[PDB]
Amino acid sequence: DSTSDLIPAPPLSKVPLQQNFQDNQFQGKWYVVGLAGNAILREDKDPQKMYATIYELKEDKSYNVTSVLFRKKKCDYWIRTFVPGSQPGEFTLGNIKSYPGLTSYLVRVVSTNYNQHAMVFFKKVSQNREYFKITLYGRTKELTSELKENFIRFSKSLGLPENHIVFPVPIDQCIDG
């Protein structure tokens, strides 16, 4: 029981796919250095904290994906499964039925060099509402102004204005494990 208004998801034709995606090289820990999306809102009062997301390639070529967040003074863990989709670097969420309200969930790796940075596009439909976000990943907690400007540029090309783009503040708790 609500109302809400969302910037429309871009057509998928506007979201590049990393050429020749290498699933093994993409494994390991990534820090979320940038976040943009139609439900992302810059909040001056209570700024969003950096978290990390860990990709583990399984025998069957799906990823176990684990995100580690610092919240309420504890380390919080969200584990889920990315199942290979229609082309290399594209995934759907495994076990979608087990998430109530969730009808679709798409992941597309837009670009990466595997050992420093990545951008990843996510689109999900939940309670019939269409959310999308772009994540900027670093292998470390810092990235250059140049890379962050590129991420802002790309986010805008998908219809997002600046106040729907945030750069989570680096922290030491939980995510350096």
Ligand SMILES: O=C(NCCCN(CCCCN(CCCNC(=O)c1cccc(=O)n1O)C(=O)c1cccc(=O)n1O)C(=O)c1cccc(=O)n1O)c1cccc(=O)n1O
């Ligand atoms: O709009 C999006 N994100 C920005 C707002 C995130 N948020 C605020 C943060 C909440 C805190 N958590 C969520 C951590 C726990 N998660 C979940 O138990 C979960 C279960 C099933 C599906 C799913 O998606 N989740 O998250 C993150 O910081 C976190 C970390 C890592 C990955 C991740 O996804 N999240 O959120 C929301 O409440 C929200 C609003 C609307 C849709 C939505 O999916 N979420 O999570 C979005 C668009 C498309 C796919 C997608 O996954 N997301 O999040």
Ligand SMILES: [Cm+3]
């Ligand atoms: Cm989410």
